[PDB]
Amino acid sequence: TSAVQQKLAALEKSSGGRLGVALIDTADNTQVLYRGDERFPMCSTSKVMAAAAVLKQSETQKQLLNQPVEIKPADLVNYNPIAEKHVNGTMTLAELSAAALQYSDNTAMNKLIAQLGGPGGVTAFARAIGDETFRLDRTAPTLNTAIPGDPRDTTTPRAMAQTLRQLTLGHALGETQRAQLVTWLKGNTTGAASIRAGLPTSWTVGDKTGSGDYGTTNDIAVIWPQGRAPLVLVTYFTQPQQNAESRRDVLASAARIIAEGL
Template sequence: MNNFFSKFLIYFALLWMYLPASGQQLRTEIKAILDESDGLVGVGVVDFETNESIYFNAQERFPMQSVFKFPLALAVLQRVDAGEWSLDMPIEVTPADLLPNTWSPIRERYPNGNITLTLAEIIRYTVAQSDNNGCDILFRLLDGPIEVNKAVAQMTSKGIAIVADEAGMAKGWDVQFGNYSTPVAMMDLFQKFWAGRILSPASTEYLKKVLFETNTCEACMKGLLPKGAQVAHKTGRSATNAKGITAATNDAGVLLLPNGKAVGLVIFVSNSKASDSARERLIARISKAVWDQYSQLK
């Protein structure tokens, strides 16, 4: 057993030892859900107030799919904070920007292109509606995945890699696995963002609002939560290959509870043969368990 792995096991043993009884109960409940699952599942839960955490497969590399649009938005907004751009900056969207055969609410609304959208509008389409064409417009503004990867590397410790945009991922099944994140790294990114340690106060509040507006995969993290539950999150989903394997069904973000607590939640489901509804239900059950547990606390 190598030294790094030994330290990792000791860390999580100590984490379990000092986890409050309520946290141990939640960990047991999540493990029971995972025992029923198909594929590899990564989970991260962090109380942003106390920093108490629960992780499963914390250091595994999971394909992010559209969850990578969250760090992409962070990189764009850093340029806004630097004064290079503004949210009301006009961006020309040409027919060549609106690729067919990809998810794109922008294209659905403006099928002929030749329009002008503000940077704020493109960010909202990209994050809240997961628009793939909007995503790649933002990548081009930032000079491509290499530059975005460099920016993200400055935001969090190693554990996130971005090597391809949406058009790049569409070129082959294996490409998506190069855009990976560990549960720990994505949680770290959300926690720093939520605390205002990455963006200015204005940009932080703007992106929080956009994340609260996310309307993709309503059956995932929000699927079993009370009506009107406040969830600031980003989803991501891959296609299913000829062998019936879905590479990624993901949801990551922050649950804002009625008692005022903010709880980070990252759920990555990879290489699963389960149905769409089963994978969504898995995410929803974990989210409900976390919501119920932390809603009881003061």
């Protein structure tokens, strides 16, 4: 047990929930893990994998991101701030990717999933890029039920950090596509209370949040510290009762501990 792990354990003890953390520091290609091999519900952090899979498809179809997708009234689900403006109209796969990532639009996510042939298409892409842990089993919003012990729509912090590094900093995607994914993540609207809140202001962050039942509060980020090589950081948090409140502050505190421990 390292000093950073001891701090994270103390944070977890006082939070009342279960915390999972994985850091990869690309300066030295080392990792720091807390419950790194335990499974957690991804919730909407899974949208990164779906968007990335569509970006991969776009490497062999120049026009794919411009392809229109029909949005029908029946397509709207529980949280659709972008798609609802386009009902009885269309959105392109680029628009759907941006809406899913930057606004966490669930209708947009479902269109990405459908473009990949269902949740198992997202899992297939994960396997193709070397992630044997990730699984997507359901569409939105049911992928966010986050029931303790349920393997559906889960990954581990270790696996997710490794994948997010490959996607954003490594060569899982082509150069154009990697840059597009990074642009999207950096433009996220939903992240300032989560990992971002625990880091010095000068550091730049691209991230995707998630949340679900059981007070599940997640964030996965690529971080460009001031004067340091990039980091990838996953923070997952889930609680024992179905109706628990979100705890984005716990993610911020985990990020703060990680930053202080570099």
